[PDB]
Amino acid sequence: DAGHLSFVEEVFENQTRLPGGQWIYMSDNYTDVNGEKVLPKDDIECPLGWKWEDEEWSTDLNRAVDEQGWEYSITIPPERKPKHWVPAEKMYYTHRRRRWVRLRRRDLS
């Protein structure tokens, strides 16, 4: 009854392609919201003292994503990376990502 802290981990699965081409995996390929590498979701461990509450990672289709959980972008060059993501695939989009989440908890007592 001391309660627990909760935290939802969030990581992004990234893919790219050439216009009109097939999607493939980035070098990093898992990152956070802004582009920094993290490990593949399935290899991600809780910090010391925490445990997973959700049995599985999940991807939330109520967000602005397509029916498989992807949002899409393109780099608009003055910029160095994608900045604005959208739910619909268009043939000239070169980047896409899928947001995966999983709840963990830490008991206070």
Residue numbers in the entry: 943 to 1051
What wording appears in the published article?
In this study, we have determined the three dimensional structure of human dysferlin inner DysF domain by X-ray crystallography at 1.9 Å. The structure was solved by molecular replacement with the NMR structure of the inner DysF of myoferlin. Most datasets that were collected, processed and refined in space group P213 (cubic), with the best resolution dataset diffracting to 1.9 Å. Except where stated otherwise the analysis is based on the single chain in the 1.9 Å structure. The inner DysF domain construct starts at residue Met942 and ends at Gln1052 and has a Ser on the N terminus from the TEV protease site. The main secondary structure consists of two long antiparallel β-strands, one at each terminus (N terminus 946-958, C terminus 1036-1049). These β-strands are connected with a long loop (77 residues). The analysis shows that in fact there is not one continuous stack, but three on one face of the sheet. The three most frequent mutations disrupt the R/W stacks and are likely to lead to a less stable or possibly unfolded domain.
Dysferlin, a member of the ferlin protein family, is a type II anchored membrane protein with a single C terminal helix buried in the membrane. Dysferlin is not a part of the dystrophin-glycoprotein complex, but its function is linked with calcium-activated membrane repair caused by fusing aggregated intracellular vesicles with the sarcolemma at the site of injury. One DysF domain is inserted into the other DysF domain, by gene duplication, forming an inner DysF domain and a two part (N terminal and C terminal) outer DysF domain.
